[PDB]
């Protein structure tokens, strides 16, 4: 082991909405696994993801809950 989590999540989704020049741009991210944030941890270590650019919400800051992030404000559901 090395990447396990206290409470492993197997499915989680995020919708990112940003307002750019008064237009709403939406992207949707979905993850599947035995322990998603552990997998994401490993990818960041292997440098496949840039940790400095990983927003709090993708790093798990509230992990466990799928949600929408609207101009930087997370809201689960």
């Amino acid at each position: 082991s090395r990447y396990s989590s206290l409470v492993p999540i197997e499915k989680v989704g995020f919708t990112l909405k940003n307002e750019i020049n008064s237009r709403i741009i939406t992207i949707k991210l979905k993850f599947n696994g035995n322990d998603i944030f552990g997998g994401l941890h490993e990818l960041c270590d292997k440098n496949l993801i840039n940790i400095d650019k990983v927003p709090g919400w993708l790093a798990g800051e509230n992990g466990s809950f799928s949600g929408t992030i609207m101009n930087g404000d997370f809201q689960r559901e």
């Binding site: 750019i20 741009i25 599947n32 696994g33 035995n34 990818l43 940790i51």
Partner: protein
């Protein structure tokens, strides 16, 4: 399925002049192969150095059943003599004569061929190429498709087995407007936006497919389409992708 045509690609060591002739293969196959030859231009607006951008497009249809589309069998060649690797072919369908067409090309022409594989960056370029529509006046136009990128990373104990990033049609357009006008929206606007917003570098991750809804699915070693053919520009990008 909704995309029943699965294309595989092969580099070829010389520009085949099939013009003449299919006849030898026709009798071998005891079957009438139809051979179409046209010159195309990519970029299309014929104002692009009236050459170099001219390719030659060949098509061989294996005439047969029309019940199950999964057996529809077509060969497409794109050639450009002003390039170092001047031709590739691709073919769809599961017909047994496919492999018999390949060994014939070899013999008849004494060419070697190799499986073409697409790196992430090329999968991106192919996505940009797939969404170009060509009007009757040979104008190229970007059209918008809901787009989905799939990844399948290798992690301990299957911790993360799969993840995807989806950009609805309207947000693909929306992202291009912040750029703004571009014939390469995935490369220029959408893929960078993902990196800057997530730290995810698409071209470095285990990207296993890019799906343009109802149109095409671009993968590492094939392209799947709902259309019984591939677009000129997608072909041109494949050929550019195998140069040195």
């Amino acid at each position: 399925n909704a995309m029943p045509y699965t294309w595989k690609f092969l580099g070829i060591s010389k520009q085949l002049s099939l013009e003449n002739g299919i006849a030898k293969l026709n009798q071998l196959l005891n079957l009438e192969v139809d051979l179409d030859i046209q010159t195309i231009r990519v970029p299309s607006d014929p104002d692009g150095g009236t050459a170099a951008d001219e390719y030659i497009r060949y098509e061989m249809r294996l005439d047969i059943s029309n019940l199950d589309e999964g057996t529809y069998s077509k060969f497409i060649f794109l050639g450009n003599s002003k390039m170092e690797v001047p031709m590739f072919l691709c073919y769809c369908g599961t017909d047994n004569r496919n492999e018999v067409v390949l060994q014939w090309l070899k013999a008849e022409y004494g060419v070697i061929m190799w499986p073409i594989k697409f790196e992430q960056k090329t999968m991106i370029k192919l996505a940009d190429a797939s969404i170009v529509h060509v009007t009757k006046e040979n104008i190229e136009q970007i059209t918008w498709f809901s787009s989905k990128l799939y990844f399948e990373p290798e992690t301990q104990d299957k911790n993360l087995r799969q993840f995807s990033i989806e950009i609805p049609r309207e947000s693909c357009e929306g992202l291009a407007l912040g750029y703004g006008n571009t014939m390469h929206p995935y490369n220029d606007a959408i893929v960078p936006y993902i990196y800057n917003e997530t730290g995810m570098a698409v071209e470095r991750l285990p990207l296993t497919s890019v799906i343009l809804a109802g149109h095409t699915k671009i993968m590492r070693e094939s392209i799947v389409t709902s259309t019984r053919s591939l677009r000129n520009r997608v072909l041109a990008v494949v050929l550019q992708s195998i140069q040195f």
